[PDB]
Ligand binder design. Structure first.
Ligand SMILES: O=P(O)(O)O[C@@H]1[C@@H](O)[C@H](OP(=O)(O)O)[C@@H](OP(=O)(O)O)[C@H](O)[C@H]1OP(=O)(O)O
Ligand SMILES: Nc1ncnc2c1ncn2[C@@H]1O[C@H](COP(=O)(O)OP(=O)(O)O)[C@@H](O)[C@H]1O
Ligand SMILES: [Mg+2]
Length: 216
């Protein structure tokens, strides 16, 4: 009847679709997430097609969303909060890693405020599952940098406050496939300008991933 989806973070009710390639996310507090998917659809559809999982439909208070892990034999997922936290500062200055596949094995704690050294160590930990082929993990890093670059650029021209949004980084164990997409629009707001805080999260991640893709 109901199979629970293996979340990396969040407090939200998320189940598998009755059907392949679909997850059902429940809207707990308001329909704001739906209102914002539709607004972005009308005003920024290029942003929606490039960076955001497809919304196939709504069923009462459930959003039917593209399952970003679906085309992967052995997905490694990392959730990074790049939007403002409701309250509390980011655990890594410009962003907060909310969790990652096998984070329990490295004693990762989402409440622990981290140095740059710990932050980078946690991202190296997340890449461990991708194995010792060094010239193949850096292909993963570089494809991530390519899309995060275009995202940061595109964010300059979008008049939204991306409160609460996360990046979902995914890579297959064999490193043949990867992607990153923006999720969680529940707390996003219209504003008269662009979101310098959310841009500074993306550019900082670009810096960190770039240092990883270049250290020998
Ligand atoms: O709805 P809840 O259970 O109170 O928790 C949300 C929670 O969903 C969110 O974290 P994440 O789940 O997107 O990682 C928290 O985000 P912050 O990291 O920005 O604090 C929210 O703060 C929680 O909502 P609230 O602050 O209303 O409890
Ligand atoms: N479309 C998606 N495909 C796959 N996993 C997803 C998708 N959307 C969310 N997730 C998973 O759900 C978690 C929380 O989703 P999110 O939208 O941030 O919900 P919450 O409001 O609970 O924080 C992420 O950490 C990720 O593991
Ligand atoms: Mg979230």
């Amino acid at each position: 009847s109901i199979r629970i989806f293996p979340r990396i973070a969040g407090r939200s009710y998320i189940i598998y679709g009755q059907t392949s390639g679909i997850i059902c996310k429940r809207m707990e507090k308001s329909d704001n997430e739906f209102v914002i998917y539709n607004y972005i659809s009308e005003h920024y559809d290029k942003f929606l097609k490039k960076y955001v999982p497809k919304l196939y439909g709504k069923n009462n208070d459930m959003l039917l969303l593209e399952d970003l892990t679906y085309n992967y034999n052995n997905p490694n997922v990392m959730d990074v909060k790049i939007g403002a936290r409701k309250r509390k500062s980011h655990t890594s200055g410009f962003f907060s890693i909310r969790g990652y596949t096998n984070s329990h094995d490295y004693k990762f704690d989402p409440d622990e405020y981290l140095t740059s050294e710990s932050t980078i160590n946690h991202i190296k930990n997340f890449m461990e599952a991708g194995g010792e082929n060094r010239d193949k993990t850096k292909q993963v890093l570089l494809k991530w940098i390519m899309k995060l670059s275009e995202l940061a650029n595109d964010l300059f021209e979008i008049n939204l406050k991306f409160d609460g949004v996360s990046l979902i980084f995914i890579y297959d164990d064999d490193c043949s496939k990867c992607d990153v997409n923006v999720v969680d629009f529940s707390r996003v707001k219209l504003i008269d300008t662009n979101d310098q805080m959310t841009i500074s999260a993306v550019t900082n991640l670009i810096k960190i991933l770039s240092e990883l893709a270049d250290n020998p």
